[PDB]
Amino acid sequence: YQRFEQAAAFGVIASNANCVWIPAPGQLITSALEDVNIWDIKTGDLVSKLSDGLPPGASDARGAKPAECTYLEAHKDTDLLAVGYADGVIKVWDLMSKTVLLNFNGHKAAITLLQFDGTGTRLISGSKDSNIIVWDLVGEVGLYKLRSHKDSITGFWCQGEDWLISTSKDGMIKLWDLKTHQCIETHIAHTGECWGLAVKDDLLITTGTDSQVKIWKLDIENDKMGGKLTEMGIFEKQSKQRGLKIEFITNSSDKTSFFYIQNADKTIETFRIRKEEEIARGLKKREKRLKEKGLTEEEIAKSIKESYSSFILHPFQTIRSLYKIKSASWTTVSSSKLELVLTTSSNTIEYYSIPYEKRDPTSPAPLKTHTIELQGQRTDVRSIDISDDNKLLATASNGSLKIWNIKTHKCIRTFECGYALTCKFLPGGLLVILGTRNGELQLFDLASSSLLDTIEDAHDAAIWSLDLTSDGKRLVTGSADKTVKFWDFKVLKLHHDTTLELTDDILCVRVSPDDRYLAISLLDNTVKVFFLDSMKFYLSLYGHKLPVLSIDISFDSKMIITSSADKNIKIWGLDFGDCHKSLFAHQDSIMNVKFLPQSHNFFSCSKDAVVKYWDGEKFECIQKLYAHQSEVWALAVATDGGFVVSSSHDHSIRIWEETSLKAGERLMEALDLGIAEIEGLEAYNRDMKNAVLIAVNKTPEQYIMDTLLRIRMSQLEDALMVMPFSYVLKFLKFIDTVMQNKTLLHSHLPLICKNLFFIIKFNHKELVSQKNEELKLQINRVKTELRSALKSTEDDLGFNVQGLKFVKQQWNLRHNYEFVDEYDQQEKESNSARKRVFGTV
Amino acid sequence: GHTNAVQRCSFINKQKQLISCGADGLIKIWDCSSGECLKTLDGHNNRLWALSTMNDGDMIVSADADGVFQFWKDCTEQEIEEEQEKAKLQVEQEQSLQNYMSKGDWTNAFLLAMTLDHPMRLFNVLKRALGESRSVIFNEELDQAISILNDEQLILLMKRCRDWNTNAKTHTIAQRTIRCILMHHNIAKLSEIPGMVKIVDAIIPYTQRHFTRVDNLVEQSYILDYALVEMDK
Amino acid sequence: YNVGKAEKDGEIRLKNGVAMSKEELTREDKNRLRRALKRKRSKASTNIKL
């Protein structure tokens, strides 16, 4: 067999990520699923496309869907692009070389935000896994991880090396110390999620789920244990939806600051920060107005605090777009006008310019200057077809039809239509026919670039399926109105010929290549076969659990394939209607299946975003094609069979072309290292009058003590016996050193006692024989302080037991009834006394 | 879901919910969209013939057959506001507690752990505060803090001491805290605290075991004396 | 007296006497304690097409 590889991918302008603007209106950088697109706003043409490599379908290609780009961030000064992907991978891209420089893998989920530091040598990454990791570009390593948040990092602010502020979907705002790697402050930003965060000087603004927007003053150097972040006031934005992004831009000439609040709906709301003089002027005026109203000074002060937000912010203008907005970014700031660029969810780029003068803008609505719309379709493609020459590809989507040159990948013509469902080329490659959901039939000519004829009442309901005979003179249309209508082409217009009325809704109609069989799927899970010439019923294929969605007949009109919503592909013999095999092909509904021409091999696409290659004779899966991110709605095969074109819910059209130490032994090592250090420091101290320990960051006494703790008690007594006597003197010097450090002595006093006494007992005979005077002093010192530590613990135990006994006794006198008769007392004490139950043999 | 006949039905919260009264005497608040009982109000002991609502059910009035009125008022937003404020305060307490532990301000961190009821952090406060003491009981500031503790806090702290006393690896921290309490509190008051005795009853048997041990460790330490006398020969 | 299950739901108490509130525990510790709990218990037409 031969391998299919992704020859090209086009039709995507803006995927689910942010947009990065780069000055030359300048160019724009935007994500296209796994690839990144650089657009020239003025011309609207693609400047370049960033592809890592490893085309889908290759043997070396991975067996999972590619990770889509989630966040884009570029450092303008250094011309480096950092790209975050849905799988938690950061790739640093050289813009000039259009190649990957670095590859960071530290996150387990999609990356939500990337931000270069001011110097461009360190990158801060926040991801849906709730972690913020600071990376070192020159070092190619992750410096440290910030792990306080309990949900996706929505936004974070770090302009200074020393502090960082982070916001997360759990509704918390946290102040971080980059030099300590800890959270210093924690406050609840909003009642639920917190999504926006923008900081200008001390001013800090955050957005929650509702229209409430909070203002905080950022007193970094307060250092009170608190108050670095304090709530100033709350202002309500007009849009009731959540606010996604907030960004500041400052006019250098006038020092004016503006910021927007990108909502989840089709609205961007811009705000202006009032200058201090404007605030003082306004504060005095409102005081005059409110004093004129007769309110008290205390009420005036409280009202001023209640109306605090109004003084600083001024609603400037609202940008309304036809489609939902995905991301936005400031482009240019000037006294004359203010400009913004945004990306929608419907795969288009919009450039908005706002001319303004002083407080308010000049025009009621923003001026839409530039749009990039030609090279993409707003709605998902529902059907595709390829011209007989295999040069022109027709793609029908809701509201528009676009036609592409397979070689140049560029749209040639665009036609406005209804909710298109099916599209096929007529013979000659000069005409296109459509079946809209409104029952209309539309025919288009490419040369005229205009619609010739519309049959408004072609069907009473949606025209789900449409097929042509090999001769091309007849058309077969199936619709939800439970009828099949035959149409003829007479010089060009369509005349209805015959109606075939069925019992249930029609989902697919297929005409055999030889025009002898007409296979039709029904909503009752049955596929009927008819004889085209006579319209005589032939067969009723049965056995699909859910309605059949696609049908395709082999080139020899012998074998017919049915793919249903029950995830099964069933292969039948047209001679007798016998089912050769049923394949559990995909994990979701299978939308289309097509035969490879002059062969029985067929392709299949499903809602699981997988296109699979099958063998029509051996009934095995040949190749799995993982390139699409979402449902694959349509599929088309070239007449020559050279390539296959697939369109998915991600607005992408893809063309597939055919190409050890034991206890005791460890302790002896610990004694050698530690006591060499203790002896060295002592000898150094006497005169004046290692790598392992510094790496572990522990003192010599602690290092030996820890090694003692790791030894299991069942092994400890056997471990101590193995030591030679020379190490016992070393051990006795270690314990002497511990005695000075009173914190260690009481921390592990029972352990120290058990080991010491066992050592003395085991080799008592050799110890007493030695005549070392220094040894005699050590044991004396070890003895005295060992006793005091033991006595200190003992006195506390003795004091408390006598005290607690007294506490028990006094309560008895006050709240314990007493019988003078002994026998009555005994009966009570038996009942009051605690009882326990035991199994007995 | 009604045990007896339903005699009244009135929509509240616009389309969202429906309240119904039954002869059993139970008022049930249902969800129209899902058809499930969200809440049940039981203020009556007889059948209800009247059910009045005002302001979209923000206030609901129902009468028993006996003659009892139950004036119900919506408090969902009121309860939520209390939880939000409590959570806001709890967050600040947690962050303040962590800051003190890093800086080592044990006298302050001890109070926060007692209020937040974080037994592990409370143990670390006392353990590493005791470690500094080795270098009256704990220190001047923290000893005063223990003295100010009220009856509820003493019961909570003594419960931890009882549990800590059971383990021989952690009894040392327990005894000193008990030692601090006895010397800085009126023992007359400690007895009358309800339930302090049963906590005390569990402490004593474990204390005696720890005293039987340690004392034996003192006996074993005289092997050093027998070592020294042999050397002097 | 045997140190047993915590009286408060939010609290976790072990036989050794160590008590931890769920609030203070980090997430990695909650998962670790949950796993330790498991082992101890084990020993004992338009819609379709479009």
Elucidation technique: cryo-EM
Provide the 8-state DSSP code for A266. Answer: S
- For residue C9, the chain B residues in CB contact (below 8 A) are none
- Convert A83-99 to b/e letters by CB count within 10 Å (16 or more is b): bbbbbbbbbbbebeeee
- Crossing angle of the two packed helices A665-688 and A725-740, in degrees rounded to 10: 60
How many angstroms separate the CA atoms of A456 and A376, rounded?
A: 28
Structure tokens at A164: 């960082």
Q: For tokens 């004093």, what's the residue?
A: A291
Can you name the residues that pair with A437 across neighbouring β-strands?
none
DSSP designation for A242:
P
* Residue A793 forms contact with B (CB below 8 Å): yes
How close is the nearest chain C Cα to the Cα of B51, in Å?
Answer: 38
B65-68 long-range contacts, CB within 8 A, separation 24+: B68/B43, B68/B44
Q: Which residues have C-beta within 8 Å of that of residue B61, sequence separation ≥ 6?
A: B50, B51, B52, B53, B54, B69, B70, B71, B72
Quickly list DSSP for A82-120.
EEEETTSEEEEEETTTTEEEEEEE--SS-EEEEEE-TTS
What is the DSSP track for B55-121?
TTTTEEEEEESSS-EEEEE--HHHHHHHHHHHHHHHHHHHHHHHHHHHHT-HHHHHHHHHHHT-HHH
Six-digit token string for A759: 């050592």
Check CB contact under 8 Å for B172 and A746. yes
Nearest to A412 by CA among A434, A387, A388: A387
Can you read off the two tokens belonging to residue A118? 């001011």
Helices (H), chain C: 27-43, 46-49
Sheet of A653-658: strand order equals A4-10, A653-658, A643-648, A632-637
Question: How are the residues of chain A apportioned to helix, strand and coil, as percentages rounded to the nearest 5?
Answer: 20, 40, 35
Within 17-36 of C, beta carbons closer than 8 Å to B belong to 17-21, 23-24
Strand partners, A442: A434, A454
Size of interface A-B (CB pairs under 8 A): 136
Whether residues C21 and B164 touch (CB distance < 8 A) is answered with: no
Identity of residue A350: E
* Separation CA A325–CA A572 (nearest Å): 48
Q: Which of B118, B167, B201 sits opposite C21 (nearest CB)?
A: B118
Position A145: which residue type?
Answer: K
Those of residues 212-241 in A touching chain C at CB distance below 8 A are none
DSSP letter (8 states) at residue A1? -
In this complex, the residue of A764, A775, A790 whose CB is nearest that of residue B217 is A790
Tell whether B10 lies on the interface with C, counting CB pairs under 8 A: no
The answer for residues whose C-beta is within 8 angstroms of residue B79's C-beta and 6 or more apart is none
For residue B166, list chain C residues with Cβ-Cβ distance below 8 A: 1, 3, 17
Distance between CA atoms of residues A9 and A652, nearest Å? 7
The neighbour count for residue B104, using CB atoms within 10 Å, is: 13
Contact A340, A268 (CB under 8 A): yes
Q: How far apart are the first and last CA of chain B?
A: 94
H-helix or E-strand spanning residue A493: strand A493-501
DSSP class of residue A778 equals H
> Starting from the edge strand earliest in sequence, which strands make up the sheet with A122-127, in order?
A111-116, A122-127, A132-136, A141-146
User: How buried is A791 (Cβ within 10 angstroms: 0-12 exposed, 13-18 middle, 19+ buried)?
Assistant: middle
- Which residue has tokens 């950022």? A218
d(CA B137, CA B17): 61
A800 touches chain B (CB under 8 A): yes
Q: Which helix (H) or strand (E) holds A426?
A: none
Asked if residue B113 lies in contact with residue B105, where contact means CB atoms within 8 angstroms, the answer is no
Cα distance between residue A351 and residue A357, in whole Å: 20
What residues form DSSP beta bridges with A319? Answer: A268
Chain centroid, CA C45 distance in Å = 47
Resolution (A): 3.2
- Nearest C-alpha neighbor of B145 from the set B162, B170, B174, B122: B122
> Taking CB atoms and an 8 Å cutoff, what residues of chain C touch B121?
24
Cβ contacts below 8 Å, chain B against chain C, sum to 43
Looking at the complex, does the CB of residue A739 fall below 8 Å from at least one CB of chain B?
no
DSSP assigned state of A567: S
Kindly list the partner chains of chain C, i.e. chains with 3 or more CB atom pairs below 8 Å: A, B
- Residues forming a β-bridge with B10: B19
- Which residue is listed with tokens 């657009």? A39
The DSSP H or E segment spanning B8 is: strand B6-12
**In chain C, what is the greatest distance between 2 CA atoms, to the nearest angstrom?**
69
Q: Which of helix, strand or coil describes residue A704?
A: helix
Tokens of B219: 């006996």
C-alpha angle A560/A566/A569, rounded to 5°? 25
**CB pair distance less than 8 Å for C17 and B121:** no
Distance from CA of C36 to the nearest CA of B (A): 18
Are residues A342 and A19 in contact, defined by beta-carbon separation less than 8 angstroms?
A: yes
Report which residue type is found at A481: D
What single letter denotes the amino acid at residue B74?
Answer: D
Say yes or no for a CB contact (<8 Å) between B119 and C1: no
Q: Which two tokens stand for residue A345?
A: 């969810």
Q: Which amino acid does the sequence have at A314?
A: H
Compute the nearest-CA separation of B83 from chain C (Å): 16
**Is-contact A477 A465, C-beta < 8 A?**
yes
Token pair recorded at residue A132: 């913020």
How far lies A16's CA from each of A12, A211, A510, in Å?
11, 24, 37
Q: Is A260 in contact with A307 (CB distance < 8 Å)?
A: no
Contact A189/A199 with Cβ under 8 angstroms? no
**Contact assessment for residue A230 and residue A279, using Cβ atoms and an 8 Å cutoff:** no
Angle (nearest 5°) at CA A818 between A814 and A821: 165
In whole angstroms, what is the distance from residue A171 CA to residue A476 CA? 58
Nearest to B225 among A184, A186, A783 (CB): A783
Cα–Cα distance, A754 to A405 (Å, whole number): 87
Q: Which residues on A lie below 8 Å from C49 (Cβ)?
A: 464, 507, 549, 591
Write the DSSP symbol of residue A254: T
Which position has the token pair 């056995």?
A543
Q: Which of A548, A556, A484, A483 is nearest to A516 (CA)?
A: A556
Alpha helices (H) in A616-699, listed in sequence order: 665-688, 691-696
Nearest to A776 among B204, B215, B231 (CB): B231
* Rama region for A6: left / alpha / beta (φ>0; ψ in -120 to 50; rest): beta
User: Would you call C34 helix, strand, or coil by DSSP?
Assistant: helix
Three-class SS of A351-396: EEEEEEECCEECCCCCEEEEEECCCCCCCCEEEEEECCCCCEEEEE
Contacts for A521 with CB less than 8 Å, ≥ 6 apart = A506, A507, A508, A509, A527, A547, A548, A549, A550, A551, A562
> Which residues of chain B are within 8 Å of residue C17 when distances are taken between CB atoms?
163-167, 170
Which residues have a Cβ under 8 Å from the Cβ of A329 and sit 6 or more positions away? A18, A19, A20, A21, A247, A340, A341, A342
**Residues A666, A707: contact at Cβ < 8 Å?**
yes
Choose among B117, B167, B206: nearest Cβ to C21. B117
Distance, in Å, from the CA atom of A124 to the CA atom of A20, rounded to the nearest integer, reads 17
In the complex, which subunits touch A with 3 or more CB pairs below 8 angstroms? B, C
Contacts of residue A726, defined as CB under 8 A and 6 or more positions apart, other chains included, come to: none
Residue A378: Cβ within 10 Å count: 18
Residue A96: alpha-carbon gap to chain centroid: 28
DSSP annotation of A799 = H
* β-bridge mates for residue A247, sequence order: A260
Q: How many angstroms separate the CA atoms of B132 and B129, rounded?
A: 5
Q: Which of B89, B101, B114, C24 is nearest to A182 (CA)?
A: B101
Q: Do B119 and C23 touch (CB under 8 A)?
A: no
Query: What one-character DSSP code corresponds to residue A597?
Result: T
Distance from CA of C17 to the nearest CA of B (A): 5
Cβ atoms of A465 and A451 closer than 8 Å: no
The torsion angles phi and psi of B18, rounded to 5 degrees, stand at -145, 130
Of B160, B162, B168, B163, which is closest to residue B209 (Cα–Cα)? B168
Token pair for residue A119?
A: 């110097």
Q: How far is CA A65 from the centre of its chain?
A: 15
**Secondary structure class of A517 (helix, strand, coil):** strand
Q: Which residues of B touch A816 (CB under 8 A)?
A: none
Do B179 and B137 form a contact (C-beta atoms < 8 A)?
A: yes
Closest C-alpha to A236, from A268, A193, A196, A207? A207
Query: Please, which residues bridge with residue B21 across strands?
Result: B8, B27
E strand map for chain C: 11-13, 19-21
The separation between CA A29 and the C-alpha centre of its own chain, rounded to angstroms, equals: 20
Compute the half-sphere exposure of residue A685: CA atoms within 13 Å on the CB side of its CA.
Answer: 6
d(CA A298, CA B17): 44
Q: C16 and chain B: CB distance < 8 Å anywhere? A: yes
E strand intervals along A696-762: none
Residues of B in contact with A757 (CB under 8 A): 220-221, 223
Q: Cβ-count burial of A34 within 10 angstroms (0-12 exposed, 13-18 middle, 19+ buried)?
A: buried
The reply to whether residue B91 touches residue A776, judged by beta carbons under 8 angstroms, is no
- Taking a contact as any Cβ pair under 8 Å apart, which residues of chain A between 809 and 828 contact chain B? 810-811, 814
Q: How far B133 CA lies from chain C's nearest CA (Å)?
A: 23
Please, which chains are in contact with B (at least 3 CB pairs closer than 8 A)?
A, C
Per the listing, tokens 């070890």 go with A782
Q: Exposed, middle or buried by CB within 10 Å (0-12, 13-18, 19+), for A272? A: buried
Q: Of C12, C15, C18, which to mutate for an interface test with B (greatest number of B Cβ within 10 Å)?
A: C18
- Which pair of tokens denotes residue B108? 């302050």
Sequence-ordered list of residues with C-beta below 8 angstroms from that of A238, at least 6 positions apart, any chain: A211, A267, A269, A315, A318
C50 in contact with A, Cβ within 8 Å: yes
What's at B116, amino acid-wise?
L
| DSSP-derived secondary structure letter, A57 | T
Extended strands (E) in A615-674: 621-625, 632-637, 643-648, 653-658
What is the DSSP track for A151-212? S-EEEEE--SSSEEEEEETTSEEEEEETTTTEEEEEEE-SSS-EEEEEEETTEEEEEESSSE
A283's CB contacts (< 8 A; 6+ apart) are: A304, A311
CB-based contact, C39 to chain A, within 8 Å: no
- CA count, 13 A, side-chain hemisphere, B152: 3
Q: How many Å apart are CA A825 and CA C7, to the nearest integer?
A: 34
Residues in chain B with CB shorter than 8 Å from the CB of C18 are: 119-120, 123, 167
Q: Are A422 and A386 in contact (CB under 8 A)?
A: no
Q: Would you put residue A98 in left (φ > 0), alpha (ψ -120 to 50) or beta?
A: left
Residues 127-166 of chain B whose Cβ lies under 8 A from any Cβ of chain A: 130-132, 134-135
User: Are A783 and B224 within 8 A, CB to CB?
Assistant: yes
Best mutation target among B123, B175, B176, B216 (most A Cβ atoms within 10 Å) is B175
Nearest to A349 by CA among A8, A9, A654, A47: A47
